[PDB]
């Protein structure tokens, strides 16, 4: 194992370890949109851009490995100028749903604007809207709220099995939908709503019932379907309405059962 110092502090990492994976050992979380837990490593956003000690261009954390003993700073001058910029590009074509939107506090993009992005102003005029994609029982999908990334695209191809989500256009018109009018299969694809960072894919059964603000969470193993453990259930006064998958090491691979999610 080769050791390379990140933010002056030295941390030992594997030879084929990612930059964001190396950052976790130093106890620092970079701004993410494309996963690092179970979903395959892919670019297609350039948010997790980090500047090296002696480099003209910033490298993405998901793709570029550490390899050689090179210094990388998380709270650098170039990184903060990058992070504020990319956030503005994400929100130049964003439909503005925040009070109506199913997520609110649970939304990863909502937090990153508060934590990293530029606050005072955002230069934008005229945003494009996408037509609503067809969906069956679970997840009332809205294509407008989607940021057009690669998270749910690879989820159907690798984690779920049956592929449906992909690319539809080229510019700021490419939709994450199925293109052909067909309802999504069950199996384990009910967990796709929990995967997406934006408030685009969210469960239709418990839609707009309770916000992320004011909800008491408790972890409990699911009774329906065997080998199910660690599932957070929000109380939100009297009766529980929303049940989300809790992180587990061996019992479950961060995905709830389709029968248990509804």
């Amino acid at each position: 194992l080769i050791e390379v110092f990140v933010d002056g502090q030295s941390v030992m990492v594997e030879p084929g370890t990612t930059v964001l994976q190396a950052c976790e050992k130093v106890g620092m979380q970079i701004p993410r949109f494309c996963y690092h837990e179970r979903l395959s490593v892919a670019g297609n956003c350039r948010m997790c851009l980090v500047e090296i000690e002696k480099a003209p261009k910033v490298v993405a954390a998901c793709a570029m490995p550490v390899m050689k003993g090179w210094n990388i700073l998380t709270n650098s001058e170039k990184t903060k100028k990058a992070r504020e910029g990319v956030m503005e590009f994400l929100l130049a074509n964003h439909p503005l749903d925040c009070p109506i939107c199913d997520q609110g506090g649970e939304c990863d993009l909502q937090d990153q604007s508060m934590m990293f992005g530029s606050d005072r102003s955002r230069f934008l005029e005229g945003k494009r809207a996408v037509e609503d994609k067809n969906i069956g029982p679970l997840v009332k999908t809205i294509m407008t709220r989607c940021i057009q990334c690669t998270r749910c695209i690879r989820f159907a191809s690798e984690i779920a099995g049956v592929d449906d989500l992909g690319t539809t256009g080229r510019g700021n018109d490419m939709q994450v939908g199925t293109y052909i009018e067909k309802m999504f299969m069950s199996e384990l694809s009910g967990n796709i709503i929990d995967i997406c960072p934006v408030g685009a894919l969210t469960x239709x059964x418990x839609x707009x019932x309770x916000x992320x603000x004011x909800x008491x969470x408790x972890x409990x193993x699911x009774x329906x379907x065997x080998x199910x453990x660690x599932x957070x259930x929000x109380x939100x006064x009297x009766x529980x309405x929303x049940x989300x998958x809790x992180x587990x090491x061996x019992x479950x691979x961060x995905x709830x059962x389709x029968x248990x999610x509804x």
Partner: protein, 425 residues
Amino acid sequence: SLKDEDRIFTNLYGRHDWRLKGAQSRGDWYKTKEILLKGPDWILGEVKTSGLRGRGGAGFPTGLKWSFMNKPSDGRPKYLVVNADEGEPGTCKDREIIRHDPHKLVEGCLVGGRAMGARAAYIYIRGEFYNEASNLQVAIREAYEAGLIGKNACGSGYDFDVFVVRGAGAYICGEETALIESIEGKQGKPRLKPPFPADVGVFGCPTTVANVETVAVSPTICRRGGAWFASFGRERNSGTKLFNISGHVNNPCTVEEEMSVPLKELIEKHAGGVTGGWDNLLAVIPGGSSTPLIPKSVCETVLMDFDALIQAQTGLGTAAVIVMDRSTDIVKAIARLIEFYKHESCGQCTPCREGVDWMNKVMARFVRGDARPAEIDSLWEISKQIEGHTICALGDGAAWPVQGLIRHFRPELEERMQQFAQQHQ
């Protein structure tokens, strides 16, 4: 020290009369058996000793790029990749290197086959240029059947098979990572460049990306002496590259010219509109679409070489002249260049899909004159940002020409905003 234009020297001269056997009399496959008998290390050294720059719009040297793969030990069989499709607008190299002389392009794959160590060679052509693609397919039938390349030909142990594939006609032929993904079968989107280049993994194989003009120069450099290619040009950049002039001109024509050549001498030979740089206002771009437009004051000092072009504003990479007259609009012309990137944006990196589309919408307002005088300075900060935080080189290609509006100009942009402010408001 000074470079002379052509003077009975060209990489590809046959354009009027060439088919299959007619090209052979006028320098084609002269040392085909000699290059095949020579070792892979000695053949690769010939390109490195000459010091030839990359013909494609990047700036990277061709000698270092071919030697980057090398292949010491390989599990998966290696494959050769070549791009022939038109990427940047204003380039005439796509319908000249393959359309006029198809025998020269096919010989380039055979010369680089034994050097790199590839089992099969692949070429990508434009979907819109179907007539030019038919000439390349006809040359492959005259080479494989007769005995030029395939299994065992011209006294060679290494086998190489040539196959041409029709492209979609977008950014898939643009980026080096994009060509590997397009040929594989997946959607037109480039792979992540930071961790693995073409050598580490491309379509499940070690590969190398090469331009149509870059691959065609390889058999010419191998047959002739190494000093002949390095004779014309500068110390840093050497080798003759095909330059094409398009737009406001007396006669639009593509002609081969030597490196480190002045812009005033090249425009005078092809004959431009009104004047070379006295009566008509200079708005010519050194690159096809990548490089921003050169100023009226600095044009005579600018050279065709990439090393000399980097000193003033931005370096020429595509090498194509896009001259505009004084009567022609400047604001509307550059806005159309960004609109090209609006359609040729692939849909991956977020400061490009929702970036260039945001950039074009603001730029369309400058033609009308509804934009504020303060909005000019704000747009410059955004334009610089796209250049750094993108995976492929097309993100840079849309970023550079917008930077050439704030630089050099500015009173031309302010006059359009001031005119609509008094007339309408």
